[PDB]
Ligand binder design. Structure first.
Ligand SMILES: [Zn+2]
Ligand SMILES: [Zn+2]
Lengths: 116, 158, 107, 98, 196, 163
């Protein structure tokens, strides 16, 4: 879901319906600014969310001395050095799958063999 | 609309527009370099505050200016009583033979005359000064000009 | 310097002898916003100095992308004579410099 | 514990001044969408500014503390995952040597 | 250093997971009611909703975080300027000593000297207060969405030990404050009662 | 902006019903045409002079309004970098002129979208309805209530030009 913001006053643009064209238009509630919508999606409820699994990865993640090291091979550069950490989602419903960050290309891959 | 806003006019003018934002940083390849680093390092090293001084004099001497001490204070600070108590003087009653004319001339000046001013102007004891005032004037306590003596209507209405 | 508000009575014609409208004459004037270090800012912002003397020179490469400042020899060899002006924002908008001063009160 | 010690606290102002002169941009002009990779800087739990190169700043600060310029009791923590830099100077923190 | 008093600020996320609209309200001293975060943000000088969301969320693609913030803006949509927000904040204040004229200033004073005092207390630091509030909201939302675990109460890093120094410091200040009041009372009595 | 423009210090409370400069000028023209004991013991808290001067000086924020009221910006004092900047001015000769900076002000536009009133806002906040209508502003705009100074001034100016 994308929250478009107004051009003239920066306020968020809520969806509105025009019966003359039966199209989707985003309009402002204060300054009367309109724009044609690019997508027909208006709400995205994610009960089972995969977002945040790899949150916090930075350009210098390998510099962290606490993260463990591994010898698994990165399948994009043929490198053996990498740091792995479990999913960052704290809800007690996630699997113990790992996520490996390569120290040579900053690529993120997983060791899971079920869904990948 | 609103008829009043209480503005504060001033002489203002635009004297330029900002086009470039810059950050001055000394070059690392200068002979004077690394002297600012020492200056910056001295900032944290500095300790402006100073520790409390400890008096090395005999404890008995340091405590001689505390509690019941023979020494008397010479300060003139908040001596309100001394400032005003210094002024004090008595005065003899000017006889009715004389002050009777003084009061009526006083009343002719103003029609609502207070007690404190009357003692000051007459400069007489309030004891006898009361007798003449009550005999000639009356005091209104419940009126708006409460606690002010005024000449009685018998003589005022003349 | 309190004064009336809307002033529907037109009291500004006699109270003030100068135009109250903002002056745009000097608006068309380029300005550079520069942040200075503690040592440099402590001597350039002092009102007991800054009499109009030449504090240095500004050197710009012909192709641009690099700006440096060269101070004079009046620093007493206590601070670097060369500085690098890092352009934090090459394009800047919605920024302006405005001044203010008192107005004549008589007539 | 035997080697446990409790800090006495120091003035945090000199540290804040030092950070500002070393690239700690003031929080007044921080645009989150214009630099979504910068590390926030905290001093005694107060967000004072942001830094674009946290690695160099931490390396400098750590060297300064070891050299004896900053009070040893000062605690410096860099949460790389969270992109935060916390500096604590208030008294009451218990520390031990290593 | 300076006053040694403690002021608590709480940001609450009303409603449960089964609610169709969950809003965030913050508790300010001497206000008696919980105000929406957006209203407070406007009172600090940020009227547009775009910047307020920017102050809270630091990622432009974190649509999940932005979704939970929509109810807040809807609740406080009717207020769209500093003066209206300041008056809305002020009228909730428990002063009742100002008829209506200083009401706007009263709210501004409260947000300056009693809102996040540990940051600063001088005029001209509304941006810092706004940024810190967003950080608290950001931390609240991250936990609410199950990205972080609730802070441990037993984590010793968040605990402080007061030795003889700090303890006597607090006791001495209170006693000294009592001493200063006694000194003033004698001065008032001496002037009024005409004594030496 | 619509010249002339005025930049003065004024009270910003109720900055929606204040007469525009053009309205004041028009009002002047028609006006000319039409005429054609204490407690004696008080304790004061000690406050540093600098803050008091700033408080008194900054009591009335800067207001920038154009002739027609189309643009109305209100400034706020910023202490983050008030005394840490040194402005540089370039003359029309290639040289550079040094001018120290004094203060930094943040200006925000006002009344662009016809804000509501305190009484109206408070009523809507109360449980008058389950939720405010998504297009409440649009509905009230047609009724004519909750207008802007620019629209308010333009109609008045047109009401005079017609005669
Ligand atoms: Zn808009
Ligand atoms: Zn790799």
């Amino acid at each position: 879901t994308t929250f478009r913001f107004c051009r003239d006053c920066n306020n968020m643009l809520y969806p509105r319906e025009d019966k003359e064209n039966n199209r989707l238009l985003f309009e402002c509630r204060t300054c009367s600014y309109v724009e044609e919508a690019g997508s027909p999606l208006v709400y995205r409820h994610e009960l089972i969310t995969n977002i945040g699994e790899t949150a916090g990865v930075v350009q210098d993640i390998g510099s962290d001395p606490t993260l463990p090291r591994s010898d698994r091979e990165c399948p994009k550069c043929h490198s053996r050095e990498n740091v792995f950490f479990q999913s960052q989602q704290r809800r007690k419903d996630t699997s113990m799958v790992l996520f490996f960050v390569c120290l040579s290309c900053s690529h993120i891959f997983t060791s899971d063999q079920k869904n990948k | 609309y609103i008829p009043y806003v209480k503005t504060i006019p001033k002489k203002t003018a635009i004297v330029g527009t900002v086009c470039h934002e810059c950050q001055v940083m000394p070059s690392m390849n200068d002979p004077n370099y690394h002297k600012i680093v020492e200056q910056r390092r001295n900032i944290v090293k500095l300790n402006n505050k100073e520790r409390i001084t400890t008096l090395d004099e005999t404890v008995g001497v340091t405590m001689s200016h505390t509690g019941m001490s023979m020494r008397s204070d010479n300060s003139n600070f908040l001596k309100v009583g001394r400032e005003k108590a210094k002024s004090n003087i008595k005065s003899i009653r000017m006889p009715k033979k004389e002050i009777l004319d003084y009061l009526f001339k006083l009343f002719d000046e103003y029609d609502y005359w207070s007690l404190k001013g009357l003692k000051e102007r007459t400069r007489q004891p309030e004891a006898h000064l009361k007798e003449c005032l009550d005999k000639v004037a009356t005091l209104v306590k419940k009126g708006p000009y409460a606690f002010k003596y005024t000449l009685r209507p018998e003589y005022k209405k003349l | 310097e309190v004064f009336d508000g809307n002033d529907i009575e037109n009291n500004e014609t006699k109270v003030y002898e100068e135009s109250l409208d903002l002056d745009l004459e000097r608006s068309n004037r380029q300005v550079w916003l520069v942040r200075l270090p503690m040592f440099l800012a402590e001597k350039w912002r002092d009102r007991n100095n800054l009499h109009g003397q030449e504090l240095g020179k500004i050197r710009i490469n012909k192709d641009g992308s690099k700006i440096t400042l060269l101070l004079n020899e009046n620093d007493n060899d206590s601070i670097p004579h060369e500085y690098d002006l890092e352009l934090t924002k090459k394009v800047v908008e919605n920024e302006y410099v405005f001044t203010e001063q008192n107005l004549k009160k008589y007539q | 514990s035997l080697m446990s010690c409790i800090s006495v606290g120091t003035d945090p102002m000199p540290i804040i001044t030092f950070l500002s002169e070393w690239g700690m941009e003031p929080l007044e002009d921080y645009v989150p969408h214009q630099s979504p990779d910068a590390t926030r800087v905290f001093v005694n739990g107060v967000w004072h500014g942001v830094h674009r190169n946290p690695a160099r700043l931490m390396e400098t600060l750590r060297t300064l503390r070891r050299k004896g310029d900053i009070n040893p009791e000062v605690s410096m923590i860099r949460d790389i995952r969270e992109k935060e830099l916390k500096i604590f100077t208030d008294a009451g923190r218990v520390y031990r040597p290593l | 250093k300076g006053s040694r008093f403690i002021s608590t600020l709480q940001v609450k996320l009303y409603g449960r997971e089964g609610s169709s609209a969950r809003t965030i309200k913050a508790t300010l001293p001497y206000i008696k009611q919980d105000i929406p975060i957006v209203i407070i943000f406007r009172a600090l000088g940020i009227i547009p909703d775009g910047e307020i969301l920017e102050h809270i969320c630091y990622d432009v693609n974190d649509w999940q975080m932005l979704e939970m913030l929509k109810p807040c803006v809807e609740d406080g949509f009717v207020i769209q300027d500093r003066e209206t927000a300041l008056d809305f904040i002020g009228r909730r204040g428990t002063a009742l000593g100002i008829k209506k004229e200083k009401r706007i200033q009263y709210a501004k004073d409260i947000l300056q000297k009693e809102f996040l005092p540990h940051i600063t207390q001088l005029e001209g630091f509304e941006s810092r207060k706004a940024f810190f509030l967003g950080y608290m909201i950001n931390r609240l939302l991250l936990c609410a969405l199950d990205r972080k675990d609730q802070d441990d109460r037993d984590h010793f890093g968040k605990k402080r030990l007061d030795l003889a120094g700090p303890l006597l410091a607090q006791l001495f200040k209170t006693l000294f404050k009592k001493l200063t009041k006694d000194i003033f009372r004698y001065m008032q009595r001496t002037v009024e009662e005409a004594h030496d | 902006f619509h010249l002339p423009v005025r930049l003065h210090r004024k009270d910003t409370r109720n900055l929606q019903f204040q007469l525009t400069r053009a309205e004041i000028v028009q009002r002047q023209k028609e006006i000319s045409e039409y005429k054609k004991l204490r407690r004696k013991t008080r304790q004061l808290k000690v406050l540093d002079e600098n803050a008091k001067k700033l408080r008194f000086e900054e009591f009335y924020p800067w207001v920038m309004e154009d002739f027609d009221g189309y643009n109305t910006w209100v400034g706020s004092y910023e202490a983050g970098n008030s005394d840490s900047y040194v402005l540089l001015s370039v003359e029309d000769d290639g040289s550079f002129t040094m001018i120290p900076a004094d203060k930094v002000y943040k200006f925000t536009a006002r009344n662009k979208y016809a804000t509501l009133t305190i009484d109206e806002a408070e009523k809507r906040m109360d449980k008058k309805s389950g939720e405010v209508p998504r297009w409440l502003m649009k509905h009230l705009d047609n009724i004519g209530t909750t207008t802007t100074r620019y629209d308010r001034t333009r109609r008045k100016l047109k009401a005079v030009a017609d005669q």
